[PDB]
Amino acid sequence: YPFWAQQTYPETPREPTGRIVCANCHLAAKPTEVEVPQSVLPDTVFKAVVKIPYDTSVQQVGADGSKVGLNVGAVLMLPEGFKIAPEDRIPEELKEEIGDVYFQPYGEDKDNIVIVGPLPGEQYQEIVFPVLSPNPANDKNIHFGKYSVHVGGNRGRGQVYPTGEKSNNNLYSAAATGTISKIAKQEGEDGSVKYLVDIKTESGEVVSDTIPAGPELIVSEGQAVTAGDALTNNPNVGGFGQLDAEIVLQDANR
Amino acid sequence: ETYTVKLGSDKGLLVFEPAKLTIKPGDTVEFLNNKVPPHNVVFDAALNPAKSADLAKSLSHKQLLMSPGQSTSTTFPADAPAGEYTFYCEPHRGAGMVGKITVAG
Ligand code: HEC
């Protein structure tokens, strides 16, 4: 979710590698688009439209094991001075395009970074962010010049939680080499508890990895397995993307 | 009965005021997404006397309520004695957005 990124990276959402912290947990990579006007005049509202497309027929494993469609979210990074446009300045044509989303600043201080999500993807594959352009006359540090605009766009569930635990939308590798001595899908309440054991014949040791509900196996009993091998398919059908656009704050005169 | 829990006291903060709603065995109270959203609440099968979700499950809600200005309702059975049926604002769980429905007994 954006909210975890807010809670534990307020001043480092664009890591110095140029990668966005979403990547840390939303591991798979999928494309994100962003159109932005070529240029804008001081103190005017414009739209940075972001797209986060994906084959909508797909379905993902929900937290509980059942399969459900995807949700979408994003982070848009603007230069200092630029910020969410207020309601009075958003005209009605633009107002209906934004539907009823609720942009939050990444941090009360970071007005120039603006987030949204989770929201259903069917409705919000594309998102229209109003943005008020700043004014150099009323802001010395800002100037008439080119400027970068980075963006992050996510779809579907990620693989790792802030605590480092895995989620059930990911690959459960083996934690062991060995042969498999027993298997049993069982039913619990929301979904299956998969049970199994491995005999590290090499080190004379037994372990019992556990696999949550939702994935489905590749391996079978009696098959030799290597440490780190894929026990399940990878069920992740979503991912993360990022890009940047340039915008020219333009002098009214030339 | 259906009372309104303003999930982040509208012109105040991300809190659940007045935190200790002493309802009666049934009360169809709603959770209202007013600002900085969404607010969904699972029910304490952990923090309460009858920490038994199976009682209804509908009790324990959850999954991003993208309802800009709208509420969802949680009803009980009548078979609800001395119960502190505590509720969870999921994406906010800790920032004073937790409530304790207290069905008298
Ligand atoms: C440290 C963890 C972490 C970071 C960082 C993170 N996410 Fe997530 N995200 C997750 C996990 C795990 C889930 C699955 C949660 C669940 O079980 O419902 C998720 C789910 C989501 C969802 C909901 C998908 C769905 O269909 O339910 C969206 C959208 C999303 N993240 C967007 C973002 C964006 C955009 C950012 C940052 C600007 C971000 N996330 C950063 C971990 C993260």
Ligand SMILES: [Cu+2]
């Ligand atoms: Cu909340």
